[PDB]
Design a protein around this ligand. Structure first.
Ligand SMILES: [Mg+2]
Ligand SMILES: [Mg+2]
Ligand SMILES: [Mg+2]
Ligand SMILES: [Mg+2]
Ligand SMILES: [Mg+2]
Ligand SMILES: [Mg+2]
Ligand SMILES: [Mg+2]
Ligand SMILES: [Mg+2]
Ligand SMILES: [Mg+2]
Ligand SMILES: [Mg+2]
Ligand SMILES: [Mg+2]
Ligand SMILES: [Mg+2]
Ligand SMILES: [Mg+2]
Ligand SMILES: [Mg+2]
Ligand SMILES: [Mg+2]
Ligand SMILES: [Mg+2]
Ligand SMILES: [Mg+2]
Ligand SMILES: [Mg+2]
Ligand SMILES: [Mg+2]
Ligand SMILES: [Mg+2]
Ligand SMILES: [Mg+2]
Ligand SMILES: [Mg+2]
Ligand SMILES: [Mg+2]
Ligand SMILES: [Mg+2]
Ligand SMILES: [Mg+2]
Ligand SMILES: [Mg+2]
Ligand SMILES: [Mg+2]
Ligand SMILES: [Mg+2]
Ligand SMILES: [Mg+2]
Ligand SMILES: [Mg+2]
Ligand SMILES: [Mg+2]
Ligand SMILES: [Mg+2]
Ligand SMILES: [Mg+2]
Ligand SMILES: [Mg+2]
Ligand SMILES: [Mg+2]
Ligand SMILES: [Mg+2]
Ligand SMILES: [Mg+2]
Ligand SMILES: [Mg+2]
Ligand SMILES: [Mg+2]
Ligand SMILES: [Mg+2]
Ligand SMILES: [Mg+2]
Ligand SMILES: [Mg+2]
Ligand SMILES: [Mg+2]
Ligand SMILES: [Mg+2]
Ligand SMILES: [Mg+2]
Ligand SMILES: [Mg+2]
Ligand SMILES: [Mg+2]
Ligand SMILES: [Mg+2]
Ligand SMILES: [Mg+2]
Ligand SMILES: [Mg+2]
Ligand SMILES: [Mg+2]
Ligand SMILES: [Mg+2]
Ligand SMILES: [Mg+2]
Ligand SMILES: [Mg+2]
Ligand SMILES: [Mg+2]
Ligand SMILES: [Mg+2]
Ligand SMILES: [Mg+2]
Ligand SMILES: [Mg+2]
Ligand SMILES: [Mg+2]
Ligand SMILES: [Mg+2]
Ligand SMILES: [Mg+2]
Ligand SMILES: [Mg+2]
Ligand SMILES: [Mg+2]
Ligand SMILES: [Mg+2]
Ligand SMILES: [Mg+2]
Ligand SMILES: [Mg+2]
Ligand SMILES: [Mg+2]
Ligand SMILES: [Mg+2]
Ligand SMILES: [Mg+2]
Ligand SMILES: [Mg+2]
Ligand SMILES: [Mg+2]
Ligand SMILES: [Mg+2]
Ligand SMILES: [Mg+2]
Ligand SMILES: [Mg+2]
Ligand SMILES: [Mg+2]
Ligand SMILES: [Mg+2]
Ligand SMILES: [Mg+2]
Ligand SMILES: [Mg+2]
Ligand SMILES: [Mg+2]
Ligand SMILES: [Mg+2]
Ligand SMILES: [Mg+2]
Ligand SMILES: [Mg+2]
Ligand SMILES: [Mg+2]
Ligand SMILES: [Mg+2]
Ligand SMILES: [Mg+2]
Ligand SMILES: [Mg+2]
Ligand SMILES: [Mg+2]
Ligand SMILES: [Mg+2]
Ligand SMILES: [Mg+2]
Ligand SMILES: [Mg+2]
Ligand SMILES: [Mg+2]
Ligand SMILES: [Mg+2]
Ligand SMILES: [Mg+2]
Ligand SMILES: [Mg+2]
Ligand SMILES: [Mg+2]
Ligand SMILES: [Mg+2]
Ligand SMILES: [Mg+2]
Ligand SMILES: [Mg+2]
Ligand SMILES: [Mg+2]
Ligand SMILES: [Mg+2]
Ligand SMILES: [Mg+2]
Ligand SMILES: [Mg+2]
Ligand SMILES: [Mg+2]
Ligand SMILES: [Mg+2]
Ligand SMILES: [Mg+2]
Ligand SMILES: [Mg+2]
Ligand SMILES: [Mg+2]
Ligand SMILES: [Mg+2]
Ligand SMILES: [Mg+2]
Ligand SMILES: [Mg+2]
Ligand SMILES: [Mg+2]
Ligand SMILES: [Mg+2]
Ligand SMILES: [Mg+2]
Ligand SMILES: [Mg+2]
Ligand SMILES: [Mg+2]
Ligand SMILES: [Mg+2]
Ligand SMILES: [Mg+2]
Ligand SMILES: [Mg+2]
Ligand SMILES: [Mg+2]
Ligand SMILES: [Mg+2]
Ligand SMILES: [Mg+2]
Ligand SMILES: [Mg+2]
Ligand SMILES: [Mg+2]
Ligand SMILES: [Mg+2]
Ligand SMILES: [Mg+2]
Ligand SMILES: [Mg+2]
Ligand SMILES: [Mg+2]
Ligand SMILES: [Mg+2]
Ligand SMILES: [Mg+2]
Ligand SMILES: [Mg+2]
Ligand SMILES: [Mg+2]
Ligand SMILES: [Mg+2]
Ligand SMILES: [Mg+2]
Ligand SMILES: [Mg+2]
Ligand SMILES: [Mg+2]
Ligand SMILES: [Mg+2]
Ligand SMILES: [Mg+2]
Ligand SMILES: [Mg+2]
Ligand SMILES: [Mg+2]
Ligand SMILES: [Mg+2]
Ligand SMILES: [Mg+2]
Ligand SMILES: [Mg+2]
Ligand SMILES: [Mg+2]
Ligand SMILES: [Mg+2]
Ligand SMILES: [Mg+2]
Ligand SMILES: [Mg+2]
Ligand SMILES: [Mg+2]
Ligand SMILES: [Mg+2]
Ligand SMILES: [Mg+2]
Ligand SMILES: [Mg+2]
Ligand SMILES: [Mg+2]
Ligand SMILES: [Mg+2]
Ligand SMILES: [Mg+2]
Ligand SMILES: [Mg+2]
Ligand SMILES: [Mg+2]
Ligand SMILES: [Mg+2]
Ligand SMILES: [Mg+2]
Ligand SMILES: [Mg+2]
Ligand SMILES: [Zn+2]
Lengths: 208, 83, 124, 99, 138
RNA sequence: GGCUAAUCCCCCAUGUGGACCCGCCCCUUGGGGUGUGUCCAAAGGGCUUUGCCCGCUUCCGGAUGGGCCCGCGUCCCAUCAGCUAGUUGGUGGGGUAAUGGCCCACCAAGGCGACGACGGGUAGCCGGUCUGAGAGGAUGGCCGGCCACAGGGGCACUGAGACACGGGCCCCACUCCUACGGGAGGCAGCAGUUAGGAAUCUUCCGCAAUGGGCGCAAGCCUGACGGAGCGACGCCGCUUGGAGGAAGAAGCCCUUCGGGGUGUAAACUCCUGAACCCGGGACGAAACCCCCGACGAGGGGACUGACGGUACCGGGGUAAUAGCGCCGGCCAACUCCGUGCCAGCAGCCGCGGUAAUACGGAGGGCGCGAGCGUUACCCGGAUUCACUGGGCGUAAAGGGCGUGUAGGCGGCCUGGGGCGUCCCAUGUGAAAGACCACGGCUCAACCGUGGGGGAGCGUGGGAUACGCUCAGGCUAGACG
RNA sequence: AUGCGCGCUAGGUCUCUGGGUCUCCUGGGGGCCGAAGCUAACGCGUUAAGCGCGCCGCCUGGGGAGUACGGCCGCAAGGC
């Protein structure tokens, strides 16, 4: 009901790896090795030259499933970033990437984006000291995001954290791995992040 | 007659008031002559009241009548305070 | 036309006729059936299409299609009317919604059910 | 500002009262042209001093009859009867047009 | 008579240039002279001189066009690609200063008649005044 | 029929002053003086009783609330073209807070209309809203403003105010009581009933807050209002788990019978821990009030919470609802079988008469997701009423031809005016809303504070090119 | 199946009526073929269907229908 169903499957449809899986989306299982076709009876069948519509729909779906939120919440986003002063594409990206759940992932307190959401929504995180259990929450920059201490020694936490001892973090972010604090310093520009998405095709999808 | 009072601006449960000069027969919530301040009972801000006395005082001089809870706020900003 | 023409005369704003008196303006209207019957369609088709002449709460008597695989109605079956027209028979201007009032649902449709009025069966 | 207009007296026929014709122009709010309209104002002349054809300034005044809310201020132009015989020709125009 | 004079000056220019005439006469007026002056200075006509044809005053525009172009249709690029009237009689067109039109993304102009006198859009703007929008040129 | 009190009602007085007739003075529609004449005031009550409070009286100002009046904007039909006797103006009078045919007498003979009178139809108007690139189109529920009504129709009374929804009178319909004489109502206040309908809620709690009436005050009244309830009606937030897990079980689908699919999906492993349980537990509420001081300013003190044991906080804790539309083009999504112009689909083309991606089921897929579809309606696409932004040789469309009325339009020069036009200043453009910024409820929705902008109209000032206008002049148009 | 008016945009050829130092020039009508340009094509093209301005008439899918009803006109037929 949000997405919540098979996934290394829509890795497949969207036609490239997304890492909604974390560990093992880096396996030689991501099912993207073993299976670069789409789901269905027809996955192994020969391509059809897609529709201008098709392509744009697809790009949108991709961006969506990466960030892993509802159409509604996503569109309300785009519309929001559309309205704001600045370049509608990169702002979409700024805003999306400014979601608490996704900050958690990007700070590596969770392995996958969906884990990071459950992490939040179960109370494990705090933004500047008050536990904040909505995943939509907007991280403004200058905000510090920690595992709050009650959870600080629980299993999965120490797992990730003590496994991320040594890693670099995204350059709009900082990490004190001991304290499991992190700061969201600044906003990402397009290639501040990675993404396998021509954002401009999404802008176009909505201009329909 | 002309009255200085509260008019209700919050939401359900999140109750903000405008301090207001009005002819007493208006809806409390309806159109009024001057806004003279705000009052926030739940004290949610640094400033949950503001007045600008010099204005309130003018209306007082013309027989603007503060309700009690009005006048407490007025004198709280010491619109009233003598010297 | 010139501008003094437009100033003099103006442009004619242009209205539209409703494809229905389901009247009021209402989005459905109930009614009872007078005849429930079977009709043939026009040039390119044959079948036996199933329809009811229905007297309505809006006073008007109309013909309504009775969609879907099979059905239950008869002379005094009272039913609700929807609107939507059936290309290729004549003057069927409204559809019967199935599953409201005396109009049953369409038995065994597993597939497009919200339309056709049928209850989700038990996946077992 | 009691409004004050100006126009032509086309009406002689009244006891202590005159009809002034006041034209206005203005841009038309859609087709953009400027167009030119007018009305007949019923006006107060206590001494019968303004006479046919005069062109007078007209004033917002405290009320006089059903219809006179206007007293005459001053004369501006005297005797231009083109105006008078233009509107007057237009009223003789009327009663073409019917049954 | 000529119902709109000013127009017929611009339309004379129009027909001239699209047959590539090196020059053309328009019966002389002063405000017409004005518009011409602005076209000149702004780079659109080569310039104009004031003349006599059968003891009547004309203003001979001389005009320009770019170079001879290769391939078939050597005809040369127009300098005045487009020029058009706006206010006409019995449709009169006036702008505020805030309503003064920016043209062809700036590559064009607009010649409006203020009571500061006759101006290009951009002139009217630095002058900060409105008026009768006469034409656009570009 | 009788008695009686008052802040009830008269009578005489006092005249600050005010009313009115007449006269002058300023001023200019009935504004302010001013003089003679005439006319007009009051109400008591409480005490911490000889001086304080609450009241009364005439006058002038303020302040708020309104009446009236004027410019301008304000739907369709001309197959509605004429309309008008209180009509239209004058005098005098009547009425009112006040102008005015608002009314009335006499006099005059007007007033209105293709710049659309008169009739017919439809409708409450706005701030706004929806859609739109705008321009436009549509709209006016909810919140705010204004108006109008209170079963239908008349009518006054009493008041500062009404021609008064829970006030009075009469006619009418309807209901109920009736000793048949006569009486009694009026939810378009909250709730609720019933009828109608596709369809719209509890006969709830509270008087704690804010607001209103009367009261010196305590207080009383308050279905205004603050809250709960019910409906996915709307928006926003949120869950139905997170990591691991096969060369990938069974079942089911397809199959060239090799295999392909559902699919890391499942099973299983570990972790988290909606729900639910326990414990603490609000904010909104500090005034009126009492005390000191002067009933002041200022200080000190007491009470009070419907919502609520709710929100929130701490502890414990279970792997915990998925659905609906769709898969012939428009349009993202294909296969097998059934069926055989039938059953049926359908928004348009179109599909179905034995190989059906179009009907029905399956497996698969695509789209959204506590929703998803349908119907109705509005804008849109529709530059398909064309201002932006369309046309008329043959596609719809040049009047059969002329003549001219209205009306639209208007060559070259010079000058005055400055109406159009343009600029400045200022006033107005209430509050909500829209936009921007911060801020508050863990976010948002919702909310606050601030800021910006704004068309239009008022007033002052300014420019004069163009359009007007008056003036004078020319001759390229026109005419003789 | 092409409202009127005015102004601008190559030519060539035949013609009707004027004027001219009469090969030819210059007016004003009628024809044909063409520059640019237009047009859905066909075609138009200084006798515009081209470039512009003024003003009038008119159009808004096919049918029903130039019908019905109303009004007005006419003796009528019938017209608007
Ligand atoms: Mg699915
Ligand atoms: Mg591993
Ligand atoms: Mg943007
Ligand atoms: Mg990383
Ligand atoms: Mg950075
Ligand atoms: Mg990545
Ligand atoms: Mg790329
Ligand atoms: Mg869009
Ligand atoms: Mg303070
Ligand atoms: Mg067929
Ligand atoms: Mg039955
Ligand atoms: Mg339909
Ligand atoms: Mg179907
Ligand atoms: Mg007279
Ligand atoms: Mg009078
Ligand atoms: Mg006067
Ligand atoms: Mg007449
Ligand atoms: Mg006629
Ligand atoms: Mg303006
Ligand atoms: Mg007695
Ligand atoms: Mg008394
Ligand atoms: Mg006295
Ligand atoms: Mg008087
Ligand atoms: Mg006086
Ligand atoms: Mg006296
Ligand atoms: Mg006395
Ligand atoms: Mg007494
Ligand atoms: Mg008392
Ligand atoms: Mg009031
Ligand atoms: Mg006032
Ligand atoms: Mg007023
Ligand atoms: Mg009379
Ligand atoms: Mg009188
Ligand atoms: Mg009265
Ligand atoms: Mg009366
Ligand atoms: Mg008399
Ligand atoms: Mg008029
Ligand atoms: Mg009606
Ligand atoms: Mg309406
Ligand atoms: Mg109505
Ligand atoms: Mg809008
Ligand atoms: Mg918009
Ligand atoms: Mg449109
Ligand atoms: Mg608009
Ligand atoms: Mg409206
Ligand atoms: Mg309502
Ligand atoms: Mg309202
Ligand atoms: Mg009534
Ligand atoms: Mg009733
Ligand atoms: Mg009745
Ligand atoms: Mg009544
Ligand atoms: Mg009273
Ligand atoms: Mg009333
Ligand atoms: Mg009642
Ligand atoms: Mg009665
Ligand atoms: Mg009886
Ligand atoms: Mg009664
Ligand atoms: Mg009752
Ligand atoms: Mg009710
Ligand atoms: Mg019923
Ligand atoms: Mg309710
Ligand atoms: Mg409610
Ligand atoms: Mg109660
Ligand atoms: Mg209370
Ligand atoms: Mg109170
Ligand atoms: Mg009140
Ligand atoms: Mg009181
Ligand atoms: Mg006491
Ligand atoms: Mg008591
Ligand atoms: Mg009571
Ligand atoms: Mg309520
Ligand atoms: Mg329901
Ligand atoms: Mg593990
Ligand atoms: Mg496999
Ligand atoms: Mg298997
Ligand atoms: Mg098998
Ligand atoms: Mg197998
Ligand atoms: Mg899993
Ligand atoms: Mg295992
Ligand atoms: Mg546990
Ligand atoms: Mg306890
Ligand atoms: Mg409290
Ligand atoms: Mg407290
Ligand atoms: Mg109390
Ligand atoms: Mg004490
Ligand atoms: Mg004392
Ligand atoms: Mg005391
Ligand atoms: Mg105190
Ligand atoms: Mg205190
Ligand atoms: Mg309790
Ligand atoms: Mg509890
Ligand atoms: Mg807990
Ligand atoms: Mg725990
Ligand atoms: Mg499970
Ligand atoms: Mg599990
Ligand atoms: Mg689509
Ligand atoms: Mg497709
Ligand atoms: Mg069969
Ligand atoms: Mg066979
Ligand atoms: Mg078969
Ligand atoms: Mg088959
Ligand atoms: Mg076949
Ligand atoms: Mg199929
Ligand atoms: Mg289909
Ligand atoms: Mg199918
Ligand atoms: Mg399925
Ligand atoms: Mg939701
Ligand atoms: Mg439409
Ligand atoms: Mg669109
Ligand atoms: Mg459009
Ligand atoms: Mg249309
Ligand atoms: Mg078209
Ligand atoms: Mg147009
Ligand atoms: Mg068209
Ligand atoms: Mg034409
Ligand atoms: Mg035709
Ligand atoms: Mg003709
Ligand atoms: Mg003529
Ligand atoms: Mg004329
Ligand atoms: Mg002239
Ligand atoms: Mg003129
Ligand atoms: Mg001129
Ligand atoms: Mg001048
Ligand atoms: Mg001026
Ligand atoms: Mg001057
Ligand atoms: Mg105002
Ligand atoms: Mg302004
Ligand atoms: Mg505002
Ligand atoms: Mg804006
Ligand atoms: Mg915040
Ligand atoms: Mg808001
Ligand atoms: Mg503002
Ligand atoms: Mg402002
Ligand atoms: Mg604006
Ligand atoms: Mg502004
Ligand atoms: Mg505006
Ligand atoms: Mg001025
Ligand atoms: Mg001057
Ligand atoms: Mg002259
Ligand atoms: Mg001469
Ligand atoms: Mg014809
Ligand atoms: Mg030549
Ligand atoms: Mg000859
Ligand atoms: Mg010729
Ligand atoms: Mg030709
Ligand atoms: Mg050619
Ligand atoms: Mg020529
Ligand atoms: Mg020739
Ligand atoms: Mg011809
Ligand atoms: Mg021509
Ligand atoms: Mg054509
Ligand atoms: Mg059309
Ligand atoms: Mg038709
Ligand atoms: Mg005929
Ligand atoms: Mg008729
Ligand atoms: Mg007839
Ligand atoms: Mg007859
Ligand atoms: Mg005939
Ligand atoms: Zn994967």
């Amino acid at each position: 009901g949000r997405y919540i169903g098979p996934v290394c499957r829509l890795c497949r449809r969207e036609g490239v790896k997304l890492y909604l899986k974390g560990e093992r989306c880096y396996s030689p299982k991501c099912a993207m090795e073993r299976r670069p076709y789409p789901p269905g009876q027809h996955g192994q069948k020969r391509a059809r030259r897609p529709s201008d519509y098709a392509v744009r729909l697809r790009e949108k779906q991709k961006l969506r499933r990466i960030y892993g939120i509802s159409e509604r919440q996503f569109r309300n986003l785009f519309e929001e970033a559309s309205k704001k002063k600045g370049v509608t594409g990169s702002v979409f990206l700024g805003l999306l990437e400014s979601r608490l759940d996704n900050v958690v992932y990007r700070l590596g307190f969770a392995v996958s984006r969906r884990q990071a959401r459950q992490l939040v929504r179960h109370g494990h995180i705090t933004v500047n000291g008050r536990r904040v259990d909505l995943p939509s929450y907007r991280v403004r920059p200058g905000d510090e995001i920690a595992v709050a201490e009650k959870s600080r020694n629980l299993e999965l936490i120490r797992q990730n954290l003590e496994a991320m001892k040594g890693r670099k973090v995204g350059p709009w972010l900082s990490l004190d791995v001991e304290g499991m604090k992190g700061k969201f310093l600044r906003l990402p520009d397009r290639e501040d992040l990675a993404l396998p998405v021509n954002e401009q095709l999404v802008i176009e999808f909505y201009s329909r | 007659m002309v009255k200085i009072r509260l008019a209700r601006f919050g939401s359900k449960h999140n109750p903000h008031y405008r301090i207001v000069v009005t002819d007493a027969r208006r809806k409390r919530d309806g159109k009024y002559i001057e806004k003279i301040g705000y009052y926030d009972p739940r004290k949610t801000t640094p400033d949950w009241l503001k007045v600008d006395v010099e204005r309130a005082r003018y209306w007082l001089s013309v027989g603007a009548q503060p309700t009690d809870t009005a006048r407490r706020l007025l004198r709280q900003a010491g619109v009233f305070r003598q010297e | 036309p010139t501008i003094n023409q437009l100033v003099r005369k103006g442009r004619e704003k242009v209205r539209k006729k409703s494809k229905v008196p389901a009247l009021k303006g209402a989005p459905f209207r109930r009614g009872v059936c007078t005849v429930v019957r079977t009709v043939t369609p026009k040039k390119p088709n044959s079948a036996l299409r199933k329809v009811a002449k229905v007297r309505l709460t809006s006073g008007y008597e109309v013909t309504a299609y009775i969609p879907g695989e099979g059905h239950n109605l008869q002379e005094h079956s009272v039913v609700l009317i929807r609107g939507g027209r059936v290309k290729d028979l004549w003057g069927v201007r409204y559809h019967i919604v199935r599953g409201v009032y005396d109009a049953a649902g369409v038995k065994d449709r597993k597939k497009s059910r919200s339309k056709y009025g049928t209850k989700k069966p038990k996946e077992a | 500002p009691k409004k004050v207009l100006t126009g032509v007296v086309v009406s002689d026929k009244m006891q202590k009262t005159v009809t002034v014709l006041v034209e206005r122009q203005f841009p038309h709010p859609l087709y953009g042209k400027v167009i030119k309209r007018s009305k007949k104002y019923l006006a107060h002349d206590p001494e019968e001093k303004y006479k046919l054809g005069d062109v007078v300034e007209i004033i917002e005044s405290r009320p006089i009859s059903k219809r006179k809310r206007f007293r005459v201020l001053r004369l501006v132009e005297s005797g231009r009867m083109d105006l008078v015989e233009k509107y007057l020709i237009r009223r003789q125009n009327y009663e073409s047009l019917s049954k | 008579m000529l119902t709109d004079p000013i127009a017929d000056m611009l339309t004379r220019i129009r027909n001239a240039t699209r047959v590539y005439k090196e020059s053309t006469d328009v019966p002389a007026s002063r405000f017409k002279e004005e518009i011409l002056r602005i076209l000149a200075r702004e780079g659109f006509i080569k310039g104009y001189e004031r003349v006599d044809v059968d003891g009547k005053p004309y203003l001979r525009v001389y005009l320009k066009y770019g170079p001879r172009r290769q391939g078939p249709d050597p005809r040369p690029e127009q300098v005045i690609h487009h020029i058009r009237r706006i206010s006409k009689p019995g449709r009169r067109v006036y702008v505020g200063v805030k309503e003064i039109p920016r043209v062809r993304r700036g590559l064009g102009i607009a010649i409006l008649s203020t009571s500061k006198g006759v101006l290009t859009d951009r002139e009217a703007r630095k002058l900060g005044v409105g008026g009768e929008l006469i034409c656009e040129v570009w």
